Amino acid sequence: SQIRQNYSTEVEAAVNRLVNLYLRASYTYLSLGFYFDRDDVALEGVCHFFRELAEEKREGAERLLKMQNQRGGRALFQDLQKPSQDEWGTTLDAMKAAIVLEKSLNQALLDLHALGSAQADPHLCDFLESHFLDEEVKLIKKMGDHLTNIQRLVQAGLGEYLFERLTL
């Protein structure tokens, strides 16, 4: 590419894998969101929480794709695997699966940052710090808070209703 400068093939490839990870995450949240929209689950605040995360993850993928092009790398898309579950259980189960998901994304961001540092790619480092690293830390903190409040509330049916009504 006429514009490519200091952009390793290793980072280029890892960025493509990270796009797949973010779209997979977006797909997982779409599934979570619509599960809580079922008439036999019916937790609107939980549905909205997860639908908003689906959107955030899709936007993360787009930011990575934009950056890939800015650096002269080439987007390569792969199949997107379906989410790990068809049904997501309680709000507690769902929030637990979500924090596991976010931790996996965070670890992928950290690995990518380590790769960038090894490749001496300061633009990539800045990119990850500016748009991802603190976003993830904040989100994981929030999910941790939610998990603590959910568990505090487990009269489990009553607790699930109240959390959705008064927190989400």
Closest CA to 109 of 82, 91, 83, 134: 134
Query: Is residue 12 a known part of a binding site?
Result: no
Task: Select the residue whose beta carbon is closest to ligand SDS and give its number.
Answer: 54
C-alpha count within 13 angstroms, C-beta hemisphere, residue 89: 10
**Which residues, 76 to 115, sit near ligand SDS by CB under 6 A?**
80
The contact pattern for ligand SDS, residues 17-56, with x = CB under 6 A and - = no contact, is ------x--xx--x-----------------------xx-
158 binds a second copy (CB under 8 A): yes
Instruction: Between 25 and 30, name the residue whose CB sits nearer to a second copy.
Output: 30
Instruction: Between 10 and 135, name the residue whose CB sits nearer to ligand SDS.
Output: 135
SS3 content of the chain, % helix, strand, coil (to 5): 75, 0, 25
59 binds a second copy (CB under 8 A): no
Which residues participate in the annotated binding site for Fe cation?
52, 55-56, 59, 62
